[PDB]
Design a protein around this ligand. Structure first.
Ligand SMILES: C=CC1=C(C)[C@@H](Cc2[nH]c(/C=C3N=C(/C=C4\NC(=O)[C@H](C)[C@H]4CC)C(C)=C\3CCC(=O)O)c(CCC(=O)O)c2C)NC1=O
Ligand SMILES: C=CC1=C(C)[C@@H](Cc2[nH]c(/C=C3N=C(/C=C4\NC(=O)[C@H](C)[C@H]4CC)C(C)=C\3CCC(=O)O)c(CCC(=O)O)c2C)NC1=O
Ligand SMILES: C=CC1=C(C)[C@@H](Cc2[nH]c(/C=C3N=C(/C=C4\NC(=O)[C@H](C)[C@H]4CC)C(C)=C\3CCC(=O)O)c(CCC(=O)O)c2C)NC1=O
Ligand SMILES: C=CC1=C(C)[C@@H](Cc2[nH]c(/C=C3N=C(/C=C4\NC(=O)[C@H](C)[C@H]4CC)C(C)=C\3CCC(=O)O)c(CCC(=O)O)c2C)NC1=O
Ligand SMILES: CCC1=C(C)/C(=C/C2=NC(=C\c3[nH]c(/C=C4\NC(=O)[C@H](C)[C@H]4CC)c(C)c3CCC(=O)O)/C(CCC(=O)O)=C2C)NC1=O
Ligand SMILES: CCC1=C(C)/C(=C/C2=NC(=C\c3[nH]c(/C=C4\NC(=O)[C@H](C)[C@H]4CC)c(C)c3CCC(=O)O)/C(CCC(=O)O)=C2C)NC1=O
Ligand SMILES: CCC1=C(C)/C(=C/C2=NC(=C\c3[nH]c(/C=C4\NC(=O)[C@H](C)[C@H]4CC)c(C)c3CCC(=O)O)/C(CCC(=O)O)=C2C)NC1=O
Ligand SMILES: CCC1=C(C)/C(=C/C2=NC(=C\c3[nH]c(/C=C4\NC(=O)[C@H](C)[C@H]4CC)c(C)c3CCC(=O)O)/C(CCC(=O)O)=C2C)NC1=O
Ligand SMILES: CCC1=C(C)/C(=C/C2=NC(=C\c3[nH]c(/C=C4\NC(=O)[C@H](C)[C@H]4CC)c(C)c3CCC(=O)O)/C(CCC(=O)O)=C2C)NC1=O
Ligand SMILES: CCC1=C(C)/C(=C/C2=NC(=C\c3[nH]c(/C=C4\NC(=O)[C@H](C)[C@H]4CC)c(C)c3CCC(=O)O)/C(CCC(=O)O)=C2C)NC1=O
Lengths: 172, 161, 132, 22, 162, 160, 173, 49, 87, 172, 160, 161
């Protein structure tokens, strides 16, 4: 696990040199955007049960064979383990947004998840559809003002969509 | 009846030249997706009856072609449909593996729209069945594999139109 | 080399096994154990992760106010169709001709078809080489 | 051509056309 | 599943021994009760449709807000009403599985494991399903030891929801 | 009908119709008055023959109507009785045609492909037609019940 | 599998009152009924040794013969003697003792960015040997709820039902 | 295939007699062609030409 | 295959959803489970209504005549000090 | 692990259906056998030491290289492990007899066993000879009268012989 | 487009294309970058250009939406806006084709026969397109509004 | 009679959708080659008579179709050829500008091979004249422009075959 500040130190250490003056100033822009990064994460964890349940509900409307008898999310236990997966991925996407680096997301969430679903028989193409529904439910709740001052958070919601896309590709 | 390798060899042979960098460049592109196509053709073989049952129930199950007078009324006529939809889901699987839609018009498309007009089979409801069948096929094989299998469904729908 | 994995070297059970009852030892390696999985490099200055300093939000409807050979190209263009089009504009309005025949579609549907392109029917002239 | 067979005219059927509300 | 047969194999398997006479008596007691159990499962199946449409109506009579309130969780649409009667039929089907098997093993595996997490997530109320199961307990029409076996698995579902 | 396949039989054999074929077309058309009376009984008894037909079908096969059965709910049960109205109609055609040729190419040819492809238990729909048969033969005399029941059991045979 | 169908509220009560230790709590979770239903009944004797070495001892199986060597403890002594033998190894008592909850020991090297694929992801509850028996399906021939009029939900291009909630907005407004 | 234009009762006479090895291929084809499944499809709706 | 399972005639081991073959023991494919129902008679066309397989008009004989006899000239041959493990 | 009764429930839950009326009548015949299915399990449990030892002694008389030095059943620890394996396969066959279904037998005993004996060097063609000798010792002991009333148990010893044949072809 | 009818013009005349024709195909393709930007503005403004288009149409022609008007009720008003979405789409084609040739053979040829045969006042639909034109030209600069408005008024001319 | 823009608009219109990124992606590809096609059509207009004079002298000038009895003997018949070859070099110029061969079969290909069989015009010598005419056209307009103009010549030769 390393964040965005520790990744420029880990790369400068394998060169054996101090950080430059333009590498400190690029990190001072990331400190000035810190309060707006803290309100992306505050909005996706204060609505964590609404991102997951409304996107699950939209998935079995679109792919209704998953809840048919014999299906993949058919029982009470396979339905609860399905919502467990959507809640785990949203947890580690939110961990990667407060860090600025997708290191914790693929060290301990995406590490071997594609081959877990192949040994189980879970369709990884439908898990990717479920992540893409949690993505735009999260970027729509990110760029609404509603208790935040008005400004430009445009490059922060582009980064948040990048961890959602990294998780959806890495699963199928 | 040519696959991606057969089509690449034909075009490189038809000019009498060897397989240069451009011909092998596409062949390497086909071998990269070779792993994706087999798993796509794997699950489609498993859920063949389930996919066709999902498409007809989602597109034309309760429409009035299903009722008396509609084009699908009698049990012989209904049974011909799922027999007929099986070829579209099957031959599309062949195109997905071969990476070339030459097998479709060779063995499916030619004399097809000219045959449905003879029987009076509605081409409009047929394409929507294949479109719905394309929609469920993207469910199983995933997104990009659905993009591959879906690329031959609308090829059937285009020529059958 | 060594023994195979797990086999205590020297306590093999296939030492003096008969050939008639010998069973071939299956092959097993140290792959599926977790100690031999390849980790990220991370001492050569490379971590496999991704975060901030990666993601860029590129505006690609809006590259810039588009290049000068699209506007300078352009304003030449409709200086050369402007005289065309308004000649073709009120060629429509007081071309307000009367009506022949019976209305075959509601109240319209008369002799000529509405707004039909005359260049198509009139542009394909049949010609006889050595016309006679 | 049989005890159940299709003719176009007796088809009274929004399936050659596809207004999906019927 | 948890049957009377597999809880006898498991008792002998948990110590690595053969099936003694302790375990043959438990399997024999399953065979004596199975005559009343397989006639209750046959009778709940034979009147299942008239028991499900009645029990869904008993929920709408007691909790009439579920047919009027807008929202996804409620039966205020034709799609929400079909999903309500789908759930009553899930609870009735597991009861006739427990009568066939002979223990509370099918509905432990398919229904009650993970049920509290669904009702919290999708905003369903366990008092809707208790009222639906109290209808079936009073309206299946059985009597004798046939009704004793049917009510023993209906009361198992009411105790997990409450 | 008996008229059309007694023709296509003698058609294939390059010959005309024998006395064995023409004394039965003759014998069938004199039977035609009695056939329309039999079909007339089943025509306006479909309300009872179908509804009591699905009566015994659910009492004998509660699985198909129970939750999980194919005909579960208000919707499928209506279609559950719709098919019985179909097959009761085809039996009226077979009685007037004097053969299961109308029932053959409608509701019998490839019927297992349809019901297998619909998820319906084909044995269950066979049980439904048998329940209709006892209601139908209970509406007619013994001389007629040997016919009206006779076409049902052919449908029972081909439906399994 | 942390559900309240699988909670052990009386093992929890004896741990809060200092009657049992954490080594007895860890033993009681392996011998519990949810662990035998969801895990032991869907593995053979060899893959279940791999699950219980990775989760109790905190380390990976050495080779495929360690799996063979320990799977005969389950077949002859049952599951209760296998977890007594595992918990009484010196590998366990030197690392966790009887008071520490186990963990995956030495998963990640100190300066690296990646790890070693944590053990709940490396072995899920069933694998390839039970996949062809208990795997679910798509399109199950299951007779679900119907839809009856699918083209009215998503209209086509020239349909004036795409302009239907525009006549309300303009009105005579 | 026989599926969508047979009833099931037509040529199981010939299949089981052939699966058992009692008749070779040519008898199986000749008995197939001279069954009423064939003339119901290839002889009835077409002329002799 | 779905009809045979739905009719309770016999369950046919098919494929899992990705297309690997089903099997109860993971060695070979299409192995099935057995027990208390494949040896029980009288239900062969079970759930196929009014099925008529074999002499349905009579209960079969008990046939509980288990004895192995000396099979002269056809006792099977196999090596000595050896098990004929198959090639 | 599921019995004959839970097998038809698991097959009907994959369709999401109630049980048919012929499926319940075929389960009432398994209840009617009953008392005599329990006679077969009682007769091969009361003789389980002699099924194993008499068919072990018969195995090393026909295949004497198994106990020659270098053979697989030559040492004290290797001989006691051959008798331990015969007693385990006999244990899970009697579990599958009382359950009416070979699901305890090929999940707990037969799954993965062919590939295990190959990793150890154990000749799986000779394990199959020792299983087929326990089959003849069990079916000759299943149909003897000896304290049971006279009747027809022929369809139940055809099922007991079928479990022994399943364990003997899945070991090699 | 300008490319296809500059060809079929010189096609009929048995000749190649003059400098007057080839210096405008040249001048049009360099104009192509600016055309896609203009059509890109109208592409994802159809929500406002159509809905505000029908805004002024009903305020200027309340007869067509009043009871008795052709677009009366929830139904016809939806189709009342559907046609405006059509004609707004064809203007995006004409801007990219650099001519009303796409608008000519779609929505203009024989348009009076359709709307007369549908009972729709053709003058009313002409008023609708004019209301869309003021919304469209209000979304673009003066150099662009001389084009986007330029294709609407051609549609106004042919629609009466 | 559709150009590349007309064909792109038709396919995007025939599904009732707007011009998405894929439809405009091909349109941008056509506008990039807009500069090449005009200069290609420029020089072909200049050297129209020179190209046809080069093709006939290089393919069928001295063959025995030119001699008595051959298909091109009389002066009316010879004069019909260069009149006939002018259309192939002219209509191919239109396809090169429009970027779509729809105009060829609309105005050249239909009833063409059925007409030459009526007159008895040798289709074999006709295609080789167009092939030789394609060879000289690659001389003038260059390589890639010759690839563009050449792409419609063999389209005529294919359908005329
Ligand atoms: C513990 C939790 C915790 C937080 C959530 C933040 C909360 C927070 N945010 C801002 C401050 C801000 N927050 C935003 C954010 C946004 N404005 C928008 O329109 C978007 C919807 C959203 C992007 C995510 C912006 C743009 C500012 C700066 C306002 C400005 O432009 O001056 C400030 C004032 C300091 C400053 O202005 O820099 C504080 C305290 N800080 C915390 O300590
Ligand atoms: C009844 C007949 C019968 C046989 C012939 C042998 C056949 C045989 N030989 C070996 C085994 C072997 N055989 C050799 C053979 C040779 N060593 C060399 O260097 C030369 C190539 C050659 C000497 C002439 C060697 C080295 C091994 C040991 C292999 C090893 O342990 O890696 C093995 C494996 C088991 C073991 O370790 O012994 C078997 C079955 N066994 C039998 O039961
Ligand atoms: C003597 C007066 C004089 C001028 C004012 C310029 C005017 C000018 N600008 C450009 C052309 C250009 N000039 C720029 C430059 C820039 N775009 C930006 O946003 C930055 C502010 C800046 C770079 C730092 C770009 C990007 C183009 C290309 C425009 C295009 O995309 O077509 C060109 C065409 C090619 C070129 O020479 O660049 C000309 C002649 N040249 C002159 O000779
Ligand atoms: C220890 C296990 C155990 C049981 C089986 C039952 C024991 C048991 N079995 C039978 C009853 C029986 N047991 C048998 C069994 C057999 N007869 C033979 O000749 C065969 C050798 C053998 C079958 C393999 C038969 C056939 C009957 C029924 C009697 C009959 O059919 O005549 C009865 C009489 C009850 C009745 O018939 O109603 C009882 C108590 N209880 C137990 O605790
Ligand atoms: C913290 C990091 C982490 C991740 C990411 C993780 C994933 C994970 N998901 C699992 C199961 C599952 N995952 C799903 C999910 C789905 N099925 C569907 O059909 C849907 C498309 C989809 C979600 C809606 C289901 C249903 C199961 C249960 C499979 C089963 O037990 O049969 C399992 C199986 C193990 C078990 O249930 O005991 C693991 C290890 N585990 C982890 O520890
Ligand atoms: C491999 C390429 C290939 C195809 C596709 C093919 C089609 C084909 N479809 C047929 C009939 C049919 N096809 C249908 C199909 C339909 N009815 C509807 O309403 C739907 C729109 C549609 C299902 C999607 C029906 C009902 C018939 C029977 C027509 C009749 O009996 O008159 C027939 C007549 C003979 C027969 O079915 O035995 C052929 C040959 N043949 C081929 O070789
Ligand atoms: C086999 C074991 C099993 C059970 C028990 C089960 C329950 C279950 N019921 C659900 C929904 C539902 N359940 C209801 C039922 C009701 N709401 C009402 O107002 C009525 C009073 C009541 C009927 C008694 C409704 C309306 C929904 C849809 C809620 C939603 O879509 O969010 C859902 C959400 C997924 C879906 O939409 O299908 C699950 C998982 N699923 C299972 O697989
Ligand atoms: C004239 C010959 C003929 C027949 C027989 C026929 C059957 C037929 N049965 C259907 C559905 C159906 N049929 C059933 C039937 C049953 N459910 C049960 O439990 C019972 C066992 C059984 C009835 C006794 C059900 C539940 C459906 C709806 C299935 C679904 O919605 O998925 C459908 C699709 C919907 C429709 O168009 O009606 C057809 C075409 N069509 C024909 O032309
Ligand atoms: C799934 C239920 C299950 C079974 C059946 C099982 C068998 C099993 N048999 C083993 C060994 C063995 N098995 C045999 C058996 C035989 N060799 C012969 O020559 C005879 C043909 C045959 C006896 C009839 C022998 C000799 C060993 C010892 C191998 C050794 O010492 O290396 C071992 C290695 C551990 C040990 O015994 O020390 C296991 C795990 N394990 C299980 O978990
Ligand atoms: C792309 C060129 C093009 C056009 C323009 C077009 C028009 C068109 N307008 C229609 C209906 C209609 N159009 C209107 C229109 C109006 N009512 C008013 O009051 C206003 C004056 C006016 C709209 C601004 C109404 C009310 C109907 C329904 C008429 C009816 O239901 O009888 C219909 C029949 C239903 C349908 O298929 O949509 C067509 C085909 N089709 C085309 O392909």
């Amino acid at each position: 696990m390393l964040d965005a500040f520790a990744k420029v130190v880990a790369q400068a250490d394998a060169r054996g040199e101090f950080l430059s003056n333009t590498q400190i100033d690029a990190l001072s822009k990331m400190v000035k955007e810190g309060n707006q990064r803290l309100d992306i994460v505050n909005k996706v964890t204060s609505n964590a049960s609404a991102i997951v349940t409304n996107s699950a509900r939209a998935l079995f409307a679109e792919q209704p064979q998953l809840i048919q008898p014999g299906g993949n999310a058919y029982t009470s236990r396979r339905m609860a383990a399905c919502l467990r997966d959507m809640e785990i991925v949203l947890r580690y996407v939110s961990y990667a947004m407060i860090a600025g680096d997708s290191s914790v997301l693929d060290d301990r969430c995406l590490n071997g998840l594609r081959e877990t679903y192949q040994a189980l028989g879970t369709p990884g193409s439908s898990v990717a559809v479920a992540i893409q529904k949690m993505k735009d439910a999260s970027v729509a709740l990110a760029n609404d003002t509603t208790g935040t001052p008005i400004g430009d958070c445009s490059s922060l919601v582009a980064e948040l969509a990048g961890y959602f896309d990294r998780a959806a590709v890495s699963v199928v | 009846m040519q696959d991606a390798i057969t089509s690449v060899i034909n075009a490189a042979d038809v000019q009498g030249k060897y397989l240069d960098a451009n011909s092998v460049e596409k062949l390497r592109g086909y071998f990269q997706t070779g792993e994706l196509r087999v798993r796509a053709a794997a699950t489609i073989a498993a859920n063949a009856a389930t996919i066709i049952k999902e498409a007809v129930a989602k597109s034309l199950l309760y429409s009035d072609i299903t009722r008396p007078g509609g084009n699908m009324y009698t049990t012989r006529r209904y049974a011909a449909c799922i027999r007929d939809l099986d070829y579209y889901l099957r031959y599309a699987t062949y195109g997905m593996l071969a990476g070339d839609p030459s097998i479709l018009d060779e063995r499916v498309l030619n004399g097809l729209k000219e045959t449905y007009n003879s029987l009076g089979v509605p081409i409009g409801a047929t394409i929507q069945a294949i479109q719905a069948m394309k929609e469920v096929t993207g469910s199983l094989v995933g997104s990009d594999a659905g993009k591959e299998m879906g690329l031959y469904f609308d090829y059937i729908c285009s020529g059958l139109s | 080399q060594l023994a195979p994995p797990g086999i205590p070297p020297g306590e093999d059970a296939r030492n003096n096994q008969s050939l008639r009852q010998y069973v071939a030892r299956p092959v097993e390696t140290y792959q599926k154990r977790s100690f031999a999985t390849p980790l990220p490099l991370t001492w050569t200055g490379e971590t496999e992760t991704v975060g901030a300093f990666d993601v860029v939000v590129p505006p690609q409807e809006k590259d810039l106010p588009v290049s000068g050979e699209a506007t300078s190209a352009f304003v030449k263009y409709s200086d050369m169709v402007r005289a065309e089009r308004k000649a073709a504009l009120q060629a429509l309005l007081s071309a307000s001709a009367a009506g022949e025949g019976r209305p075959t579609c509601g109240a319209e549907g008369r002799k000529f078809v509405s707004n039909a392109n005359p260049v198509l029917v009139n542009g394909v002239k049949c010609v006889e080489y050595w016309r006679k | 051509s049989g005890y159940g067979d299709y003719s176009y005219s007796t088809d009274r059927t929004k399936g050659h056309v596809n207004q999906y509300y019927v | 599943m948890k049957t009377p047969i597999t809880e006898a194999i498991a008792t002998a398997d948990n110590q690595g021994r053969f099936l003694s006479n302790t375990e043959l008596q438990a399997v024999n007691g399953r065979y004596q009760r199975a005559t009343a159990s397989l006639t209750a499962a046959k009778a709940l199946t034979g009147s299942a449709q008239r028991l499900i449409t009645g029990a869904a109506q008993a929920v709408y009579n007691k909790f009439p807000y579920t047919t009027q309130m807008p929202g996804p969780a409620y039966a205020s649409s034709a799609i929400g009403k079909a999903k309500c009667a789908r759930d009553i039929g899930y609870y009735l089907r597991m009861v006739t599985y427990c009568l066939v098997v002979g223990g509370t093993g099918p509905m432990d595996e398919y229904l009650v494991a993970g049920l509290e997490e669904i009702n919290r997530s999708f905003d369903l109320s366990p008092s809707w399903y208790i009222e639906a199961l109290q209808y079936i307990k009073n309206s299946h029409g059985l009597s004798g030891q046939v009704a004793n076996e049917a009510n023993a698995y209906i009361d198992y579902a009411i105790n997990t929801l409450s | 009908s008996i008229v059309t396949k007694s023709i296509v039989n003698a058609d294939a054999e390059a010959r005309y119709l024998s006395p064995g074929e023409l004394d039965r077309i003759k014998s069938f058309v004199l039977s035609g008055q009695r056939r329309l009376r039999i079909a007339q009984t089943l025509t306006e008894n479909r309300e009872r023959i179908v509804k009591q037909g699905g009566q015994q079908l659910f009492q004998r096969r509660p699985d198909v109507v129970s939750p999980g059965g194919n005909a579960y709910g208000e919707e499928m049960t209506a279609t559950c009785l719709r098919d019985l109205d179909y097959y009761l109609r085809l039996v009226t055609y077979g009685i007037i045609a004097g053969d299961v040729t109308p029932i053959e190419e409608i509701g019998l040819v490839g019927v297992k492909e349809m019901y297998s492809a619909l998820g319906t238990p084909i044995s269950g729909v066979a049980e439904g037609i048998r329940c209709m048969k006892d209601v139908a033969c209970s509406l007619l005399s013994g001389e007629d019940a040997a016919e009206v029941g006779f076409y049902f059991d052919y449908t029972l045979a081909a439906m399994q | 599998q942390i559900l309240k169908s699988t909670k052990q509220p009386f093992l929890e009560s004896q741990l809060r009152f200092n009657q049992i230790s954490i080594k007895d709590f860890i033993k009681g979770l392996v011998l519990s009924a949810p662990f035998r239903d969801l895990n032991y009944n869907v593995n053979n004797n060899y893959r279940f040794v791999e699950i219980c070495v990775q989760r109790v001892l905190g380390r990976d199986i050495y080779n495929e013969r360690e799996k063979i060597a320990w799977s005969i403890i389950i077949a002859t002594q049952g599951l209760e003697g296998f977890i007594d033998t595992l918990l009484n190894t010196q590998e366990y008592l030197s690392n966790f003792g009887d008071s520490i909850v186990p963990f995956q020991r030495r998963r990640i090297i100190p300066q690296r960015s990646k790890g070693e694929m944590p053990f709940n992801l490396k072995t899920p509850r069933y694998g390839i040997e039970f996949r062809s028996k208990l795997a679910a399906t798509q399109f199950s021939w299951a007779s679900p709820i119907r839809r009856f009029r699918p083209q009215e939900q998503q209209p086509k291009a020239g349909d004036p039902a795409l302009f239907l909630n525009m006549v309300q907005e303009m009105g005579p407004g | 295939d026989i599926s969508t234009f047979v009833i099931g009762n037509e040529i199981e006479n010939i299949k089981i007699q052939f699966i058992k090895g009692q008749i070779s291929v040519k008898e199986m084809i000749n008995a197939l062609g001279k069954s009423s499944v064939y003339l119901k499809e290839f002889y009835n709706p077409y002329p002799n030409i | 295959a779905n009809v045979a399972g739905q009719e309770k005639i016999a369950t046919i081991s098919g494929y899992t959803w990705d297309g690997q073959p089903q099997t109860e023991i993971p060695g070979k494919p299409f192995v099935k489970s057995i027990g208390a129902m494949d040896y029980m008679d009288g239900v062969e066309g079970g759930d196929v209504v009014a099925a008529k397989v074999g002499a349905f008009w009579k209960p079969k004989a008990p046939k509980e005549v288990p004895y192995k006899r000396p099979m002269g000239a056809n006792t099977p041959e196999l090596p000595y000090n050896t098990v004929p493990r198959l090639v």
